[PDB]
Scaffold this active site. Structure first.
Site, PDB file in Angstrom:
ATOM      1  N   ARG A 137      88.814  70.050  76.940  1.00 26.70           N
ATOM      2  CA  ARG A 137      89.766  70.565  75.950  1.00 26.70           C
ATOM      3  C   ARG A 137      90.488  69.395  75.262  1.00 26.70           C
ATOM      4  O   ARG A 137      90.709  68.345  75.874  1.00 26.70           O
ATOM      5  CB  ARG A 137      90.792  71.513  76.603  1.00 26.70           C
ATOM      6  CG  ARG A 137      90.214  72.862  76.993  1.00 26.70           C
ATOM      7  CD  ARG A 137      91.231  73.727  77.714  1.00 26.70           C
ATOM      8  NE  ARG A 137      90.667  75.036  78.054  1.00 26.70           N
ATOM      9  CZ  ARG A 137      90.804  75.641  79.231  1.00 26.70           C
ATOM     10  NH1 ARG A 137      91.503  75.068  80.202  1.00 26.70           N
ATOM     11  NH2 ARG A 137      90.242  76.819  79.447  1.00 26.70           N
ATOM     12  N   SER A 142      94.548  79.596  75.080  1.00 29.86           N
ATOM     13  CA  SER A 142      94.590  79.075  76.461  1.00 29.86           C
ATOM     14  C   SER A 142      96.017  78.693  76.936  1.00 29.86           C
ATOM     15  O   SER A 142      96.219  77.688  77.637  1.00 29.86           O
ATOM     16  CB  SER A 142      93.593  77.934  76.645  1.00 29.86           C
ATOM     17  OG  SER A 142      92.293  78.402  76.325  1.00 29.86           O
TER      18      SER A 142
HETATM   19  N1  LIG Z   1     100.970  76.402  84.255  1.00 30.64           N
HETATM   20  C1  LIG Z   1      99.676  76.280  84.567  1.00 30.64           C
HETATM   21  N2  LIG Z   1      99.259  75.122  85.137  1.00 30.64           N
HETATM   22  C2  LIG Z   1      97.950  74.939  85.343  1.00 30.64           C
HETATM   23  N3  LIG Z   1      96.934  75.762  85.060  1.00 30.64           N
HETATM   24  C3  LIG Z   1      97.375  76.904  84.499  1.00 30.64           C
HETATM   25  C4  LIG Z   1      98.693  77.243  84.245  1.00 30.64           C
HETATM   26  N4  LIG Z   1      98.771  78.490  83.639  1.00 30.64           N
HETATM   27  C5  LIG Z   1      97.515  78.853  83.517  1.00 30.64           C
HETATM   28  N5  LIG Z   1      96.618  77.932  83.992  1.00 30.64           N
HETATM   29  C6  LIG Z   1      95.166  77.939  83.838  1.00 30.64           C
HETATM   30  O1  LIG Z   1      94.849  77.584  82.507  1.00 30.64           O
HETATM   31  C7  LIG Z   1      93.569  78.160  82.149  1.00 30.64           C
HETATM   32  C8  LIG Z   1      93.652  78.852  80.805  1.00 30.64           C
HETATM   33  O2  LIG Z   1      94.498  80.024  80.897  1.00 30.64           O
HETATM   34  P1  LIG Z   1      94.048  81.569  80.597  1.00 30.64           P
HETATM   35  O3  LIG Z   1      92.538  81.734  80.486  1.00 30.64           O
HETATM   36  O4  LIG Z   1      94.648  82.624  81.433  1.00 30.64           O
HETATM   37  O5  LIG Z   1      94.610  81.699  79.115  1.00 30.64           O
HETATM   38  P2  LIG Z   1      94.526  82.722  77.903  1.00 30.64           P
HETATM   39  O6  LIG Z   1      95.845  82.482  77.153  1.00 30.64           O
HETATM   40  O7  LIG Z   1      94.329  84.112  78.354  1.00 30.64           O
HETATM   41  O8  LIG Z   1      93.280  82.203  77.054  1.00 30.64           O
HETATM   42  P3  LIG Z   1      92.377  82.666  75.825  1.00 30.64           P
HETATM   43  O9  LIG Z   1      92.927  83.965  75.215  1.00 30.64           O
HETATM   44  O10 LIG Z   1      92.389  81.592  74.849  1.00 30.64           O
HETATM   45  O11 LIG Z   1      91.010  82.944  76.461  1.00 30.64           O
HETATM   46  C9  LIG Z   1      93.144  79.036  83.331  1.00 30.64           C
HETATM   47  O12 LIG Z   1      92.157  78.366  84.107  1.00 30.64           O
HETATM   48  C10 LIG Z   1      94.466  79.273  84.077  1.00 30.64           C
HETATM   49  O13 LIG Z   1      94.308  79.569  85.458  1.00 30.64           O
HETATM   50  N1  LIG Z   2      91.063  78.836  73.518  1.00 28.66           N
HETATM   51  C1  LIG Z   2      90.387  79.709  72.771  1.00 28.66           C
HETATM   52  N2  LIG Z   2      89.750  79.287  71.674  1.00 28.66           N
HETATM   53  C2  LIG Z   2      89.071  80.273  71.035  1.00 28.66           C
HETATM   54  C3  LIG Z   2      88.961  81.609  71.396  1.00 28.66           C
HETATM   55  N3  LIG Z   2      88.238  82.309  70.443  1.00 28.66           N
HETATM   56  C4  LIG Z   2      87.922  81.406  69.540  1.00 28.66           C
HETATM   57  N4  LIG Z   2      88.414  80.154  69.827  1.00 28.66           N
HETATM   58  C5  LIG Z   2      88.361  78.945  68.979  1.00 28.66           C
HETATM   59  C6  LIG Z   2      87.267  77.963  69.369  1.00 28.66           C
HETATM   60  C7  LIG Z   2      86.907  77.325  68.034  1.00 28.66           C
HETATM   61  O1  LIG Z   2      87.784  76.241  67.721  1.00 28.66           O
HETATM   62  C8  LIG Z   2      87.102  78.478  67.046  1.00 28.66           C
HETATM   63  C9  LIG Z   2      85.865  79.260  66.670  1.00 28.66           C
HETATM   64  O2  LIG Z   2      85.275  79.886  67.836  1.00 28.66           O
HETATM   65  P1  LIG Z   2      84.574  81.322  67.872  1.00 28.66           P
HETATM   66  O3  LIG Z   2      85.513  82.381  67.429  1.00 28.66           O
HETATM   67  O4  LIG Z   2      84.071  81.599  69.285  1.00 28.66           O
HETATM   68  O5  LIG Z   2      83.367  81.178  66.925  1.00 28.66           O
HETATM   69  O6  LIG Z   2      88.088  79.351  67.644  1.00 28.66           O
HETATM   70  C10 LIG Z   2      89.650  82.037  72.612  1.00 28.66           C
HETATM   71  O7  LIG Z   2      89.625  83.145  73.132  1.00 28.66           O
HETATM   72  N5  LIG Z   2      90.351  81.006  73.212  1.00 28.66           N
HETATM   73  O1  LIG Z   3      88.115  78.688  80.523  1.00 22.30           O
HETATM   74  C1  LIG Z   3      87.539  79.669  80.125  1.00 22.30           C
HETATM   75  N1  LIG Z   3      86.497  79.450  79.172  1.00 22.30           N
HETATM   76  O2  LIG Z   3      87.103  79.115  77.945  1.00 22.30           O
HETATM   77  C2  LIG Z   3      85.473  80.469  79.070  1.00 22.30           C
HETATM   78  C3  LIG Z   3      84.192  80.142  79.802  1.00 22.30           C
HETATM   79  O3  LIG Z   3      83.530  79.114  79.326  1.00 22.30           O
HETATM   80  O4  LIG Z   3      83.819  80.797  80.755  1.00 22.30           O
END
Ligand SMILES: Nc1ncnc2c1ncn2[C@@H]1O[C@H](COP(=O)(O)OP(=O)(O)OP(=O)(O)O)[C@@H](O)[C@H]1O
Ligand SMILES: Nc1nc2c(ncn2[C@H]2C[C@H](O)[C@@H](COP(=O)(O)O)O2)c(=O)[nH]1
Ligand SMILES: O=CN(O)CC(=O)O
Ligand SMILES: Nc1ncnc2c1ncn2[C@@H]1O[C@H](COP(=O)(O)OP(=O)(O)OP(=O)(O)O)[C@@H](O)[C@H]1O
Ligand SMILES: Nc1nc2c(ncn2[C@H]2C[C@H](O)[C@@H](COP(=O)(O)O)O2)c(=O)[nH]1
Lengths: 343, 343
Positions: A269, A14
């Site tokens: 989170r 995230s």
């Molecule tokens: N600098 C920022 N300030 C506030 N919100 C932000 C910022 N950058 C991103 N976000 C928001 O943070 C949230 C998490 O980011 P995003 O889902 O794109 O991450 P990701 O790295 O692709 O996540 P993951 O692979 O773990 O699913 C989103 O709701 C996004 O819009």
């Molecule tokens: N933020 C984030 N956490 C994840 C993601 N995939 C898995 N996790 C984290 C959540 C839990 O702490 C752990 C196990 O989750 P899962 O792989 O969904 O069973 O890994 C992802 O895409 N984004």
């Molecule tokens: O912020 C995105 N989630 O981690 C996934 C979802 O619950 O839709």
């Protein structure tokens, strides 16, 4: 052959991979966008006009002005209903001249059965409980009577994906014919199955080697790695695992920020202070060429400038030439700054 | 940083990776030997003196005159009884100044439960039924109450491995302190989970990207890839899967050679004619820098010289600079010839 730019997360996920992927797609104009997503969590991109994409299947790079190919890797785990909705939402971008290719061995999520199997770990390890591992396990069982798990077999009775499912030969040719490729990694370095937090981790390694393997990209195709990080790394809510020895769990109150939640379950989170140890480990394995440091809006200039600084020395200590090129000050294309322009 | 030589298979396995690994270890004198084996694979090396090593756990590279580190990757699935036997058999080589490192997340095989779970696929897909996938699945389940699957947890009650099990930090430091590394891949390119024969395949991809990910080796450490091939590719006995459109199944009587038997089982190996299609696919993905063409003893000079030739053009067609550097004429170190010396 070096034509692949790969986006990788350096922490617990995230970090804003969705934002940098969409930003890089608009700026570099890749003809091919590729990923290997599982339904664990989404990826968000918001452009300069305020248009928003929240994807679990399609890469965020579909916003590329030169888009020709959209590729869903063999490591993909996806809901067909979700893919249908994502294609429909971006119908204007995914016109007649755009080929959508689903690897024949990509995994079809059984929403009922695969999520029901993960109810236990959804509490015990704070798992997203999206059915990612249960679907992965069903594919691994390799039962010849099971024609309901891989895209190739599912397409023989569910025609919604039959036009998109390609052969392994078509997959290799699509990559060969590509001029410039954006490969989108998911999750986070510290969530890797083989990092030190096991069993409080995901079902695969989240490293450039594992993401290139899951997308079937040959190693000589790699041009550069774009590592992503936050000033305050996050974990999902609940008993989601430990942290590094040089870091502490904070509260959203302490940061003076609105509590971040998952989109669907609304789980709060967990938030931590920046870890230099985590950065050295991520730098050693991921070896990024460029870094995107996001959520700088949560700190004062002195604070995020110090973290840019820590990142670059952590890279140098692990024989990595990584430079912090981008700085994020919000969730939109307009909030992405060039480091050189602000410090 | 480029100090890793990786041995990979370009066909359906049993090409003689064990022989070339032992040959390269004696010639190049690596200080570190690393792998990520599963119990489905047996690897054989026979030195110039007639000493034989048949390993399922330890790399064959332990024959290196400069050996300092022996590393068993996070992707490893191993029997503790088997590891004990292999260490004992090579006690002279594995002296006080050699460190044996087992990744904390390497998987401990439960010989009763994991093999019993694979009885079905042992017939349906001709699986070795060694418990490889059943052990992998148990690790993927990530149940916090299960302290019997990963090496780290098993080391707390089974003292036979306690001295060998390291931390993730020790693993990264061991790779960083290494001068020259030999990484030993297993199985075969065409056996990859995501190649076209699914479900008649193994439980992972057998590509350089997956093998580097399963050994935790960062991508910039890769120096070169040594691809291995046979003049007549093989498969295990039974309903073990299809072949490529340009090849045909042969008999051992047709070749005038003694029937080969599978290492883990006892079944007669299926044998096929050389496939140029398989070679182009393996070349595209694996991108070897050097090739070892083995079992040339099964053909006349014109026959194996033509195969050397087909391999090099198949490489060139898939943007690969691969050169056939070694030719195998038997199972020992003495039977490895330099291509330049015989053609
Ligand atoms: N600098 C920022 N300030 C506030 N919100 C932000 C910022 N950058 C991103 N976000 C928001 O943070 C949230 C998490 O980011 P995003 O889902 O794109 O991450 P990701 O790295 O692709 O996540 P993951 O692979 O773990 O699913 C989103 O709701 C996004 O819009
Ligand atoms: N933020 C984030 N956490 C994840 C993601 N995939 C898995 N996790 C984290 C959540 C839990 O702490 C752990 C196990 O989750 P899962 O792989 O969904 O069973 O890994 C992802 O895409 N984004
Ligand atoms: O912020 C995105 N989630 O981690 C996934 C979802 O619950 O839709
Ligand atoms: N040129 C040769 N002629 C005859 N027998 C050979 C030759 N080279 C190797 N062998 C033998 O044939 C078998 C080949 O299997 P081996 O274990 O060496 O291969 P592998 O590539 O490591 O297997 P895996 O598919 O499990 O990774 C062994 O029994 C080996 O001793
Ligand atoms: N020759 C060979 N075949 C293997 C190896 N590992 C797996 N296989 C083959 C045997 C079966 O056709 C298929 C499934 O085997 P398994 O991974 O044991 O479930 O993969 C290996 O190392 N060598």
């Amino acid at each position: 052959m070096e034509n692949v730019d790969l986006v990788i997360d350096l922490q617990f996920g995230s970090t804003g991979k969705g934002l940098i992927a969409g930003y890089l797609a608009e700026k570099n104009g890749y003809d091919t966008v590729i990923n290997a997503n599982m339904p664990n969590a989404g990826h968000t991109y918001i452009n300069a006009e305020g248009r928003k994409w929240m994807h679990k299947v399609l890469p965020n790079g579909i916003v590329s002005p030169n888009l020709k190919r959209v590729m869903l890797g063999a490591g993909s785990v996806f809901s067909i209903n979700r893919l249908m909705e994502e294609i429909e939402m971006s119908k204007d971008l995914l016109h007649d001249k755009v080929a959508i290719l689903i690897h024949p061995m990509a995994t079809v999520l059984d929403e009922e059965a695969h999520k029901k199997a993960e109810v236990g770990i959804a509490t015990s390890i704070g798992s997203t409980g999206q059915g990612s591992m249960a679907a992965m396990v069903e594919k691994l069982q390799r039962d010849p009577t099971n024609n309901t798990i891989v895209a190739r077999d599912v397409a023989q009775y569910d025609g919604r994906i039959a036009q998109y499912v390609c052969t392994v030969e078509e997959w290799d040719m699509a990559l060969m014919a590509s001029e410039r490729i954006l490969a989108e990694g998911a999750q986070g370095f510290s969530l890797s199955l083989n990092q030190e937090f096991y069993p409080y981790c995901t079902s695969r390694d989240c490293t450039p080697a594992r993401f290139l393997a899951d997308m079937g990209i040959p190693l000589p195709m790699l041009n550069k790695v774009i590592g992503t990080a936050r000033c305050h790394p996050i974990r999902v809510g609940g008993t989601s695992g430990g942290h590094y020895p040089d870091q502490e769990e904070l509260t959203w109150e302490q940061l003076g920020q609105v509590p971040e939640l998952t989109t669907v379950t609304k789980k709060v989170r967990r938030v931590f202070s920046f870890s230099f140890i985590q950065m050295q480990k991520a730098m050693w394995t991921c070896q990024p060429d460029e870094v995107f440091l996001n959520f700088c809006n949560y700190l004062s200039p002195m604070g995020w400038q110090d973290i840019v600084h820590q990142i670059e020395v952590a890279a140098q200590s692990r024989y990595c030439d990584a430079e912090v090129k981008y700085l994020g000050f919000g969730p939109t294309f307009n909030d992405v700054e060039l480091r050189e322009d602000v410090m």
